[PDB]
């Protein structure tokens, strides 16, 4: 049953509570709820997504940015970046899977294997991720000639139909440049290749959010409870240090009620909010909890540390012909290409947008258009690391988000971005794009030296919106990993984190589906007891 007002709930005791019904949370709730003996509560701050159509309908997605469905987290001033950047974060069931561009990717096997081998995450590798990626999808490419794909899973993945004439040409220009067409999600990582994406979206136009995919169909289920418009402010523990529940609130200035957990709590409030909530609950770097008068329950110096993203740049063009006026999601093509020899993963990616993207350029006096396209290079494995810290001990204050863009001491992320800009310029200048490529609007042909292009990037870069790493897994000996390999918070019991926070290292690709995968795994971990 769905509860929109906490007063209607008479039992606040549950076997499992899952906080935050986003990409991972929904999934873990949906899966845990499959044993009908066991009871499950899933608590989210945003509202229900059913009958909301700015959320349900994918081609509308961009309209959600900065709306009442976005938490809207601006960043701290940047040493070497764009101080006007906002990390949009969906606030609604399905979380960011309800506002994202639905671009769907298996993570590369070399990303996931490195979790175990390079980063201490025992049991986190491809053998583990592969049967789960399988389970979560109903993929168009399923067949005997692609047995790695699942055919009956909740999240519908479809191939984007190659209809955009500029899209098709951009590919033709890509071939001309040394970038072949590749199939996505075949099991073999794409290093140098490009194509129309797969997307997680149903036949009708409705996105395949983790809420549309996992929750909707189980709403009326006997053992499962959906609490929405409820915000968590604290986790609650024992003299034994077993997590017993969570305190939540009906409007911010309204009251505080406690749901209690017989078995476990799962935090799935994502890369920005999970570390906040843990710190408000006494779990983090001690000196920092001391700074704000939060009493320390566990000194865990790694909470809110290791913030990772895909920084994004942009290169904008005037179209010589008219652009498409309908799309799946306006960003239909992706391009991988290495900048360096010897990599088993591309260090550079570019999306293609059949629209302008003047979010960060307008305020800087760069001219625009209503008829053009964009090329958006991103660093797939940035070496900059940042933080999420508390602004105060007040749960209502937004956290301080400081990804510290382009601060890696080697100057690598800047170097990949500079090169990405150059490459996008190169792709567009190709003969298969003579009929389309017009005048370059930003940064404008004017900018040519490493130095000029750097300045443009520092001013005008965005994010692809993939913040991760902030409550990371790792070895049991590693003091700097808040979680052990089975997703349990150290120094406490009965508490696990399951969302983008847990990544020891970013993945190469748009991470949503990988986050959905993580929830699946956590579900399997929890329900493997025993
Ligand atoms: C937001 C964004 C991200 C995005 C994207 C475009 C935008 C604008 N495009 C993507 C794409 O095309 N393909 C892809 O692979 N990823 C894309 N993303 C990023 C991706 O969507 C996210 O990385 C992924 O969604 C992360 O999921 P995660 O489970 O880690 O976090 P979440 O989805 O944001 O879920 C958190 C939920 O919990 C609620 N919440 C937050 N705080 C509280 C409190 N205190 N109490 C109760 N609930 C809380 C949030 O509202 C959210 O629903």
Coordinates of C-alpha atoms and ligand atoms in Angstrom, one line a residue:
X1 CA 0.0 0.0 0.0
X2 CA 0.9 3.6 -0.7
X3 CA 1.0 6.1 2.3
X4 CA 1.1 9.8 1.5
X5 CA 0.5 11.0 5.1
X6 CA 2.3 9.3 8.0
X7 CA -0.7 9.5 10.3
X8 CA -2.4 6.7 8.4
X9 CA 0.4 4.3 9.3
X10 CA -0.3 2.5 12.6
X11 CA 2.6 0.0 12.4
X12 CA 6.0 1.8 12.1
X13 CA 7.9 -1.4 12.7
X14 CA 9.2 -3.2 9.6
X15 CA 11.7 -6.0 8.9
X16 CA 13.7 -3.8 6.4
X17 CA 13.6 0.0 5.8
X18 CA 15.0 1.5 2.6
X19 CA 15.7 5.2 2.6
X20 CA 15.4 6.9 -0.8
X21 CA 13.6 5.3 -3.7
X22 CA 16.0 6.2 -6.5
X23 CA 18.1 4.1 -8.9
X24 CA 19.4 1.6 -6.3
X25 CA 16.8 2.1 -3.5
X26 CA 13.7 1.1 -5.5
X27 CA 15.5 -1.9 -6.8
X28 CA 16.6 -3.1 -3.4
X29 CA 13.2 -2.5 -1.9
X30 CA 11.4 -4.3 -4.9
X31 CA 13.8 -7.3 -4.6
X32 CA 13.7 -7.6 -0.8
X33 CA 9.9 -7.5 -0.9
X34 CA 9.9 -10.7 -3.0
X35 CA 9.9 -12.8 0.1
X36 CA 6.3 -12.2 1.3
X37 CA 7.1 -13.4 4.8
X38 CA 9.5 -10.4 5.1
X39 CA 8.0 -6.8 5.3
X40 CA 9.5 -3.8 3.6
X41 CA 9.2 0.0 3.9
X42 CA 10.6 2.3 1.2
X43 CA 10.8 6.0 2.3
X44 CA 11.3 8.8 -0.1
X45 CA 11.3 12.7 0.3
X46 CA 9.9 13.5 -3.1
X47 CA 6.4 12.7 -4.2
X48 CA 5.0 9.7 -6.2
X49 CA 5.8 9.7 -10.0
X50 CA 2.5 8.1 -11.2
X51 CA 0.3 10.7 -12.9
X52 CA 3.2 13.2 -12.9
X53 CA 4.0 13.5 -16.6
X54 CA 7.0 15.9 -16.7
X55 CA 8.8 13.0 -14.9
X56 CA 7.2 9.9 -16.7
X57 CA 7.7 11.2 -20.3
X58 CA 11.4 11.0 -21.2
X59 CA 11.5 13.7 -23.9
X60 CA 10.5 16.3 -21.3
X61 CA 13.5 15.5 -19.0
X62 CA 15.4 18.7 -19.4
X63 CA 12.5 20.7 -18.1
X64 CA 12.8 19.1 -14.6
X65 CA 16.2 20.7 -14.1
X66 CA 15.8 23.5 -11.4
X67 CA 12.1 22.6 -11.0
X68 CA 10.2 21.4 -7.9
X69 CA 11.4 18.0 -8.6
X70 CA 15.2 19.0 -8.3
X71 CA 16.9 19.3 -4.9
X72 CA 19.2 21.8 -6.7
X73 CA 22.7 21.7 -5.1
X74 CA 25.1 24.4 -6.3
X75 CA 28.7 23.9 -5.7
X76 CA 31.4 25.5 -3.5
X77 CA 33.5 28.1 -5.4
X78 CA 36.2 26.3 -7.5
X79 CA 39.9 26.8 -7.4
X80 CA 40.0 25.8 -11.1
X81 CA 36.5 25.5 -12.3
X82 CA 33.0 26.9 -13.0
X83 CA 31.7 28.3 -9.8
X84 CA 28.2 28.6 -11.4
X85 CA 27.6 24.9 -11.6
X86 CA 24.6 23.1 -10.1
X87 CA 24.4 19.4 -9.4
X88 CA 20.8 18.7 -10.2
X89 CA 19.4 15.9 -8.1
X90 CA 16.0 14.5 -8.6
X91 CA 13.5 14.6 -5.8
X92 CA 10.7 12.2 -6.6
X93 CA 10.3 8.4 -6.7
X94 CA 12.9 6.7 -8.9
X95 CA 15.3 9.4 -7.8
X96 CA 17.7 10.5 -10.5
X97 CA 16.5 7.6 -12.8
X98 CA 13.3 9.7 -12.9
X99 CA 15.0 12.9 -14.3
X100 CA 18.0 11.5 -16.2
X101 CA 18.4 11.2 -20.0
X102 CA 17.9 7.4 -19.8
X103 CA 21.2 6.7 -21.6
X104 CA 21.8 3.0 -20.7
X105 CA 25.1 1.2 -20.5
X106 CA 26.7 -1.9 -19.0
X107 CA 29.8 -0.9 -17.2
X108 CA 33.0 -2.2 -18.9
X109 CA 34.3 -5.4 -17.4
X110 CA 37.6 -3.7 -16.7
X111 CA 35.9 -1.2 -14.4
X112 CA 34.2 -3.8 -12.3
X113 CA 37.0 -6.3 -12.1
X114 CA 39.2 -3.6 -10.7
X115 CA 36.9 -3.1 -7.8
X116 CA 38.1 -6.4 -6.4
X117 CA 41.6 -6.6 -7.7
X118 CA 42.6 -2.9 -7.5
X119 CA 40.3 -1.5 -4.8
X120 CA 39.7 -4.3 -2.2
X121 CA 36.0 -4.8 -2.9
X122 CA 36.1 -8.6 -2.5
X123 CA 33.4 -10.2 -4.7
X124 CA 32.9 -7.0 -6.8
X125 CA 33.8 -7.9 -10.4
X126 CA 32.2 -8.9 -13.8
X127 CA 31.1 -12.5 -12.8
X128 CA 29.0 -10.8 -10.2
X129 CA 27.7 -7.9 -12.2
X130 CA 26.9 -9.9 -15.4
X131 CA 24.0 -12.1 -14.1
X132 CA 22.4 -9.0 -12.5
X133 CA 22.7 -6.7 -15.5
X134 CA 20.9 -9.7 -17.1
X135 CA 18.2 -9.9 -14.6
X136 CA 17.4 -6.2 -14.4
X137 CA 16.8 -5.7 -18.2
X138 CA 14.4 -6.6 -20.8
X139 CA 16.8 -5.7 -23.7
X140 CA 15.9 -5.5 -27.4
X141 CA 19.2 -7.1 -28.3
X142 CA 18.4 -10.3 -26.3
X143 CA 18.6 -13.5 -28.3
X144 CA 20.5 -16.7 -28.6
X145 CA 23.0 -14.6 -30.5
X146 CA 23.5 -12.4 -27.5
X147 CA 22.9 -14.7 -24.5
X148 CA 24.5 -12.1 -22.1
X149 CA 21.2 -10.1 -22.3
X150 CA 18.2 -10.6 -20.2
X151 CA 14.8 -10.9 -21.8
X152 CA 12.3 -10.7 -18.9
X153 CA 13.7 -8.0 -16.6
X154 CA 11.8 -5.0 -15.1
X155 CA 13.9 -2.2 -16.8
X156 CA 13.2 -2.0 -20.5
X157 CA 16.2 -1.2 -22.7
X158 CA 15.6 -0.2 -26.3
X159 CA 17.8 0.8 -29.2
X160 CA 17.4 4.4 -30.2
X161 CA 16.2 4.4 -33.9
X162 CA 18.8 6.1 -36.2
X163 CA 16.5 8.8 -37.6
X164 CA 18.3 12.0 -36.9
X165 CA 19.9 13.0 -40.3
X166 CA 22.6 15.1 -38.5
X167 CA 23.2 12.2 -36.1
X168 CA 23.7 9.7 -39.0
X169 CA 26.0 12.2 -40.6
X170 CA 28.0 12.7 -37.4
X171 CA 28.6 9.0 -37.3
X172 CA 29.7 9.2 -41.0
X173 CA 32.1 12.0 -39.9
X174 CA 33.2 9.8 -37.0
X175 CA 34.1 6.9 -39.4
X176 CA 36.0 9.5 -41.5
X177 CA 38.0 10.3 -38.4
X178 CA 39.1 6.9 -37.1
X179 CA 36.1 6.2 -35.0
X180 CA 34.1 3.2 -36.2
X181 CA 30.4 2.5 -35.4
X182 CA 30.2 0.1 -32.5
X183 CA 27.4 -1.8 -30.8
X184 CA 26.8 -0.9 -27.2
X185 CA 26.3 -3.3 -24.3
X186 CA 27.6 -6.4 -26.2
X187 CA 29.8 -7.4 -23.3
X188 CA 32.9 -6.0 -25.0
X189 CA 34.0 -2.6 -23.9
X190 CA 34.1 0.2 -26.5
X191 CA 37.4 2.0 -26.6
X192 CA 37.3 3.7 -30.0
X193 CA 33.7 3.7 -31.4
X194 CA 30.4 5.6 -31.6
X195 CA 26.7 4.9 -32.1
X196 CA 23.1 5.8 -31.3
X197 CA 22.7 4.8 -27.6
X198 CA 20.6 2.2 -26.1
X199 CA 18.2 3.9 -23.6
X200 CA 16.1 2.5 -20.8
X201 CA 12.7 3.6 -22.1
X202 CA 9.3 1.7 -22.8
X203 CA 7.6 1.5 -26.1
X204 CA 5.1 4.2 -25.3
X205 CA 7.6 7.1 -24.4
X206 CA 7.5 6.6 -20.6
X207 CA 11.1 6.3 -19.1
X208 CA 12.1 3.0 -17.6
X209 CA 12.9 4.5 -14.2
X210 CA 13.5 2.3 -11.3
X211 CA 10.1 3.4 -10.0
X212 CA 8.3 2.7 -13.2
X213 CA 10.4 -0.5 -13.4
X214 CA 10.4 -1.9 -9.9
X215 CA 7.8 -0.2 -7.7
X216 CA 4.6 0.7 -9.6
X217 CA 3.8 -3.0 -10.2
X218 CA 4.3 -3.9 -6.5
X219 CA 2.5 -0.9 -4.9
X220 CA -0.5 -2.9 -3.7
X221 CA 1.7 -5.8 -2.6
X222 CA 0.8 -7.1 1.0
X223 CA 4.3 -7.0 2.6
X224 CA 5.4 -3.7 1.0
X225 CA 4.9 -0.1 2.0
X226 CA 5.5 3.1 0.0
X227 CA 6.0 6.2 2.1
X228 CA 6.6 9.3 0.1
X229 CA 6.8 13.1 0.9
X230 CA 8.8 11.9 3.9
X231 CA 12.2 13.1 4.6
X232 CA 14.8 11.4 6.8
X233 CA 16.9 13.5 9.1
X234 CA 18.7 10.9 11.3
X235 CA 19.5 7.2 11.7
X236 CA 18.9 5.7 15.1
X237 CA 21.1 3.2 16.9
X238 CA 21.5 1.0 20.1
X239 CA 23.7 0.9 23.1
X240 CA 24.9 -2.2 21.2
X241 CA 25.2 0.1 18.1
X242 CA 22.6 -1.8 16.0
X243 CA 20.7 0.5 13.7
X244 CA 17.1 0.3 14.9
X245 CA 15.4 2.8 12.6
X246 CA 15.2 6.2 11.1
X247 CA 13.6 9.5 12.2
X248 CA 11.6 11.3 9.4
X249 CA 9.6 14.5 8.8
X250 CA 6.4 15.5 7.0
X251 CA 7.2 19.0 5.6
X252 CA 10.6 20.2 7.2
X253 CA 9.0 22.3 10.0
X254 CA 6.5 19.5 10.8
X255 CA 7.0 16.7 13.2
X256 CA 9.5 13.8 13.7
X257 CA 8.3 10.2 13.6
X258 CA 10.3 7.0 14.0
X259 CA 10.1 4.0 11.7
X260 CA 11.9 1.1 13.3
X261 CA 13.7 -1.9 11.7
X262 CA 13.7 -5.4 13.0
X263 CA 16.4 -6.5 10.5
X264 CA 18.2 -3.8 8.5
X265 CA 18.3 -0.3 7.1
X266 CA 19.5 0.5 3.7
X267 CA 20.6 4.1 2.9
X268 CA 20.0 4.9 -0.8
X269 CA 19.8 8.7 -0.7
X270 CA 22.7 8.8 -3.3
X271 CA 26.1 10.4 -3.6
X272 CA 25.2 13.8 -2.1
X273 CA 22.6 13.0 0.5
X274 CA 23.8 9.6 1.8
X275 CA 27.0 11.0 3.2
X276 CA 25.0 14.0 4.7
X277 CA 22.7 11.7 6.5
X278 CA 25.4 9.5 7.8
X279 CA 27.2 12.6 9.2
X280 CA 24.0 13.9 10.8
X281 CA 23.7 10.5 12.4
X282 CA 27.2 10.6 14.0
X283 CA 29.1 8.7 11.3
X284 CA 32.0 10.5 9.6
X285 CA 35.3 12.3 10.1
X286 CA 35.3 13.2 13.8
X287 CA 36.9 16.7 13.7
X288 CA 34.1 17.6 11.3
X289 CA 31.3 16.3 13.4
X290 CA 32.9 18.2 16.3
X291 CA 32.9 21.4 14.2
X292 CA 29.1 21.3 14.0
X293 CA 28.3 19.8 17.5
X294 CA 27.3 16.4 16.2
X295 CA 28.2 13.7 18.7
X296 CA 30.5 11.0 17.2
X297 CA 29.1 7.4 17.0
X298 CA 31.9 6.2 14.6
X299 CA 35.0 8.0 13.5
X300 CA 34.9 7.3 9.7
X301 CA 37.2 9.7 7.9
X302 CA 36.1 8.5 4.5
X303 CA 32.4 9.6 4.6
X304 CA 31.9 12.5 2.2
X305 CA 35.4 12.0 0.9
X306 CA 36.4 10.7 -2.6
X307 CA 33.8 12.6 -4.6
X308 CA 34.1 11.7 -8.3
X309 CA 32.3 12.9 -11.4
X310 CA 32.5 13.1 -15.1
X311 CA 33.5 16.8 -15.7
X312 CA 31.9 18.0 -19.0
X313 CA 32.9 20.6 -21.6
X314 CA 30.9 21.8 -24.5
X315 CA 31.4 22.8 -28.2
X316 CA 28.5 24.4 -29.8
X317 CA 27.6 24.8 -33.5
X318 CA 25.2 26.7 -35.8
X319 CA 23.3 24.2 -38.0
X320 CA 23.3 25.0 -41.7
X321 CA 20.0 23.1 -42.1
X322 CA 17.0 22.7 -39.8
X323 CA 17.5 20.4 -36.8
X324 CA 15.1 17.6 -35.7
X325 CA 12.1 18.8 -33.7
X326 CA 11.4 15.5 -32.0
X327 CA 13.9 13.1 -30.3
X328 CA 14.0 10.4 -27.8
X329 CA 16.0 12.7 -25.5
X330 CA 17.9 15.1 -27.6
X331 CA 21.3 13.5 -26.8
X332 CA 21.1 10.3 -28.9
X333 CA 24.6 9.6 -29.9
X334 CA 27.8 8.8 -27.8
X335 CA 31.4 8.7 -28.9
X336 CA 34.4 7.0 -27.2
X337 CA 38.0 7.4 -28.3
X338 CA 41.3 7.1 -26.5
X339 CA 43.7 10.1 -26.3
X340 CA 46.7 7.9 -25.3
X341 CA 48.0 4.5 -26.3
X342 CA 47.7 1.3 -24.1
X343 CA 44.2 1.8 -22.5
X344 CA 41.7 -0.9 -22.2
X345 CA 39.1 1.9 -21.6
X346 CA 38.5 5.2 -23.3
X347 CA 39.6 8.1 -21.2
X348 CA 37.4 10.5 -23.3
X349 CA 33.7 10.5 -24.1
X350 CA 31.4 12.9 -26.1
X351 CA 27.7 13.0 -26.3
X352 CA 25.9 14.6 -29.3
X353 CA 23.0 16.9 -28.7
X354 CA 20.5 17.9 -31.4
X355 CA 20.0 21.2 -29.5
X356 CA 22.2 24.1 -28.2
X357 CA 23.5 23.9 -24.6
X358 CA 24.1 27.4 -23.5
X359 CA 23.6 26.8 -19.8
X360 CA 27.2 27.8 -19.0
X361 CA 28.1 30.0 -21.9
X362 CA 25.3 32.6 -22.1
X363 CA 26.5 34.4 -18.9
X364 CA 29.9 34.7 -20.5
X365 CA 28.8 36.4 -23.7
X366 CA 28.9 33.5 -26.0
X367 CA 26.3 33.9 -28.8
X368 CA 23.6 31.4 -29.3
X369 CA 21.0 30.0 -31.7
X370 CA 17.7 28.2 -31.8
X371 CA 19.0 25.9 -34.6
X372 CA 22.2 24.0 -33.8
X373 CA 23.9 21.0 -32.1
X374 CA 26.3 20.4 -29.3
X375 CA 29.4 18.2 -28.6
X376 CA 30.1 17.5 -25.0
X377 CA 33.4 15.9 -24.1
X378 CA 33.7 14.4 -20.6
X379 CA 36.7 12.8 -18.7
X380 CA 35.6 9.2 -18.1
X381 CA 38.1 8.7 -15.3
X382 CA 38.9 12.1 -13.8
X383 CA 41.6 12.2 -11.1
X384 CA 40.3 15.1 -9.3
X385 CA 38.8 14.1 -5.9
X386 CA 36.3 16.3 -3.9
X387 CA 34.1 16.3 -0.8
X388 CA 30.6 16.6 0.5
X389 CA 30.5 18.2 3.8
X390 CA 27.9 19.5 6.2
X391 CA 27.0 23.2 6.1
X392 CA 25.5 22.9 9.6
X393 CA 23.9 20.4 11.9
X394 CA 20.5 21.5 10.4
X395 CA 19.1 18.7 8.2
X396 CA 17.4 21.3 6.1
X397 CA 20.6 23.1 4.9
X398 CA 22.0 21.9 1.7
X399 CA 25.4 20.2 2.0
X400 CA 28.6 21.8 0.7
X401 CA 29.5 20.1 -2.6
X402 CA 33.0 20.6 -3.7
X403 CA 34.1 18.2 -6.4
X404 CA 37.3 20.2 -6.8
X405 CA 37.3 20.1 -10.6
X406 CA 40.6 20.0 -12.5
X407 CA 42.6 19.9 -9.4
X408 CA 44.4 16.7 -9.9
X409 CA 48.1 17.7 -9.5
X410 CA 49.1 16.0 -12.8
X411 CA 46.8 18.2 -14.9
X412 CA 45.3 15.2 -16.5
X413 CA 41.6 16.0 -16.5
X414 CA 42.2 19.4 -18.1
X415 CA 44.4 17.6 -20.7
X416 CA 41.7 15.1 -21.6
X417 CA 39.1 17.9 -21.8
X418 CA 41.3 20.1 -24.0
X419 CA 41.9 17.2 -26.3
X420 CA 38.1 16.4 -26.2
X421 CA 37.4 19.9 -27.5
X422 CA 40.0 19.5 -30.3
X423 CA 38.5 16.1 -31.2
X424 CA 34.9 17.4 -31.4
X425 CA 36.2 20.2 -33.6
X426 CA 37.9 17.6 -35.7
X427 CA 34.8 15.3 -36.0
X428 CA 32.5 18.2 -37.0
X429 CA 34.9 19.5 -39.7
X430 CA 34.7 16.2 -41.5
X431 CA 33.3 16.0 -45.1
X432 CA 30.3 13.9 -44.0
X433 CA 29.3 17.0 -42.0
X434 CA 29.9 19.7 -44.6
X435 CA 26.2 20.2 -45.1
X436 CA 25.4 20.7 -41.4
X437 CA 28.4 22.1 -39.5
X438 CA 28.0 25.9 -39.3
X439 CA 29.8 28.6 -37.3
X440 CA 31.3 27.5 -34.0
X441 CA 29.5 29.5 -31.2
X442 CA 31.5 28.3 -28.2
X443 CA 34.4 28.5 -27.5
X444 CA 34.6 29.9 -31.1
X445 CA 37.3 29.4 -33.6
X446 CA 39.1 32.3 -31.9
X447 CA 40.2 30.0 -29.0
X448 CA 43.2 28.0 -30.2
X449 CA 46.1 27.5 -27.7
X450 CA 46.1 25.1 -24.8
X451 CA 45.8 28.3 -22.7
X452 CA 42.8 29.8 -24.4
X453 CA 40.9 26.5 -24.3
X454 CA 41.7 25.9 -20.6
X455 CA 40.1 29.3 -19.7
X456 CA 37.0 28.5 -21.7
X457 CA 36.7 25.1 -19.8
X458 CA 37.3 26.7 -16.3
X459 CA 34.5 29.2 -17.1
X460 CA 32.0 27.1 -18.9
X461 CA 32.2 23.4 -18.1
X462 CA 29.2 21.4 -16.8
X463 CA 28.9 17.9 -15.4
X464 CA 27.3 14.9 -17.0
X465 CA 25.6 14.6 -13.6
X466 CA 27.4 11.5 -12.4
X467 CA 28.5 12.1 -8.8
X468 CA 29.8 9.0 -7.0
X469 CA 32.3 7.6 -4.5
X470 CA 31.3 9.5 -1.4
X471 CA 30.7 6.5 0.9
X472 CA 33.0 3.9 -0.7
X473 CA 33.5 0.2 -0.4
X474 CA 36.9 -1.3 0.1
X475 CA 39.0 -3.6 2.2
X476 CA 38.2 -4.3 5.9
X477 CA 41.6 -2.9 6.9
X478 CA 41.2 0.3 4.9
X479 CA 40.2 3.0 7.4
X480 CA 39.3 5.3 4.4
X481 CA 36.5 3.1 3.1
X482 CA 33.3 3.7 5.0
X483 CA 31.9 0.3 3.9
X484 CA 33.0 -3.3 3.7
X485 CA 32.6 -5.4 0.5
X486 CA 29.1 -6.5 1.6
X487 CA 27.9 -2.9 1.7
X488 CA 27.8 -2.6 5.6
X489 CA 28.8 0.6 7.3
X490 CA 31.8 -0.1 9.6
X491 CA 31.6 0.5 13.3
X492 CA 27.9 -0.2 13.2
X493 CA 25.6 -3.1 12.5
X494 CA 22.3 -3.5 10.7
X495 CA 23.2 -0.7 8.3
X496 CA 24.2 -0.8 4.7
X497 CA 24.6 1.8 1.9
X498 CA 23.3 1.0 -1.6
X499 CA 23.6 3.8 -4.3
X500 CA 26.2 5.7 -6.3
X501 CA 28.2 6.6 -3.2
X502 CA 29.7 3.1 -2.9
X503 CA 31.9 3.2 -6.1
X504 CA 35.6 2.9 -5.3
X505 CA 36.2 4.4 -8.7
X506 CA 34.0 5.8 -11.3
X507 CA 32.9 3.7 -14.2
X508 CA 33.6 4.8 -17.9
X509 CA 30.0 5.2 -18.9
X510 CA 26.8 6.9 -17.7
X511 CA 26.4 5.0 -14.4
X512 CA 22.6 4.7 -13.9
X513 CA 22.2 1.1 -14.9
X514 CA 25.3 0.3 -12.9
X515 CA 23.6 1.8 -9.9
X516 CA 20.5 -0.2 -10.5
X517 CA 22.9 -3.2 -10.7
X518 CA 24.3 -2.3 -7.2
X519 CA 20.9 -2.4 -5.6
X520 CA 20.3 -5.8 -7.0
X521 CA 23.6 -6.9 -5.5
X522 CA 22.8 -5.5 -2.1
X523 CA 19.4 -7.2 -2.1
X524 CA 21.2 -10.5 -2.9
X525 CA 23.6 -9.8 -0.1
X526 CA 21.0 -8.9 2.5
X527 CA 18.8 -11.9 1.5
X528 CA 21.8 -14.2 1.7
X529 CA 21.3 -14.1 5.5
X530 CA 20.6 -16.9 5.4
Ligands
LIG1 C1 20.3 13.8 -12.3 C2 21.0 13.6 -13.7 C3 21.7 12.4 -13.6 C4 21.8 11.6 -14.8 C5 21.4 12.1 -16.0 C6 20.9 13.4 -16.1 C7 20.7 14.1 -14.9 C8 20.1 15.5 -15.0 N1 21.6 11.3 -17.2 C9 22.0 10.0 -17.0 C10 21.9 9.1 -18.1 O1 21.5 9.4 -19.2 N2 22.4 7.8 -18.0 C11 22.9 7.4 -16.8 O2 23.4 6.3 -16.7 N3 22.9 8.2 -15.7 C12 22.4 9.5 -15.8 N4 22.3 10.3 -14.7 C13 22.9 9.9 -13.4 C14 22.2 8.7 -12.8 O3 20.8 9.0 -13.0 C15 22.5 8.7 -11.3 O4 23.9 8.5 -11.2 C16 21.8 7.6 -10.6 O5 20.4 7.9 -10.8 C17 22.1 7.6 -9.1 O6 21.1 6.9 -8.4 P1 21.3 6.8 -6.8 O7 20.5 5.6 -6.3 O8 22.7 6.7 -6.3 O9 20.7 8.1 -6.2 P2 19.3 8.8 -6.6 O10 18.8 8.2 -7.9 O11 19.5 10.3 -6.7 O12 18.4 8.3 -5.4 C18 18.3 9.0 -4.1 C19 16.8 9.2 -3.8 O13 16.6 9.4 -2.4 C20 15.9 10.6 -2.2 N5 16.4 11.3 -1.0 C21 17.5 12.1 -0.9 N6 17.6 12.5 0.4 C22 16.6 12.0 1.1 C23 16.3 12.1 2.5 N7 17.0 12.8 3.3 N8 15.2 11.4 2.9 C24 14.4 10.7 2.1 N9 14.8 10.6 0.7 C25 15.9 11.2 0.3 C26 16.1 11.5 -3.4 O14 15.0 12.4 -3.6 C27 16.2 10.4 -4.5 O15 15.0 10.0 -4.9

